[PDB]
């Protein structure tokens, strides 16, 4: 070494040319993922591909004040919303068995989120004009007229955010 430079620290003492990789296809992959998600949301025919996730609090004192999307509503939250986990996972609601509600604030906030999602739901009959009032907390099946008039209206994707 010479002059007044930082002492060198470069970790290039192994065969690194075999490990170099450069992403020429970053935006190409962007396009491919966009196309795939567009194709599946066309395939499922109206129902959004997004699933409802709970609002949870980030751990550690660094991110104490911040909330984000957790994975899965708890059993207590699903019960407060009035539905079983097995039924909830069939209508785009994520459920996890690991989280627990240590605070009434989190419990009620996620329950009210679930209730808002349930009220926003409109259910398509399983058997083509054989509407039934549903089980496991699934809302009653919408009928032909409301389904027709709601199918041509923009979906509320802000609830998932």
């Amino acid at each position: 070494v010479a002059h007044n430079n930082v002492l060198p620290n470069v970790h290039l003492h192994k065969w690194w040319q075999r490990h170099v990789r450069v992403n020429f296809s970053k935006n190409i992959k962007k396009k491919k993922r966009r196309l795939l998600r567009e194709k599946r949301r066309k395939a499922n025919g109206g129902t959004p591909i997004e699933k409802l996730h709970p609002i949870v609090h980030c751990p550690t004192q660094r991110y104490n004040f911040r909330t984000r999307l957790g994975k899965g509503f708890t059993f207590e939250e699903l019960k407060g919303a009035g539905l079983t986990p097995r039924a909830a996972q069939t209508i785009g609601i994520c459920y996890d068995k690991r989280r627990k509600n240590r605070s009434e604030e989190s419990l009620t906030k996620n329950v009210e989120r679930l209730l808002k999602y349930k009220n926003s739901l409109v259910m398509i009959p399983l058997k083509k004009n054989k509407a039934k009032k549903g089980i496991g907390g699934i809302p009653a099946d919408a009928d032909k007229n409301t389904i027709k008039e709601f199918r041509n209206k923009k979906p509320l994707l802000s609830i998932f955010k």
Binding site: V1, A2, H3, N4, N5, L7, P8, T60, Q61, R62, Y63
Partner: protein, 73 residues
Amino acid sequence: ATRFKKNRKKRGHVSAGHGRVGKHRKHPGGRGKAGGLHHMRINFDKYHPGYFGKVGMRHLNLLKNRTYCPTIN
């Protein structure tokens, strides 16, 4: 950018600006931080005083999130 390089202006100068006597050899002083405390000691002591040795006690796993604390006056 390659036409602005300094080597271009030494195109016909034999030694390429690296000296006719000392020449440009391959690591004539060692590799990396080789000579600290032995023959690069003057450089190390003149520009990086407290480099050698260790001070203080170990913190085995840190978890910086515990002590993260931005300040405002």
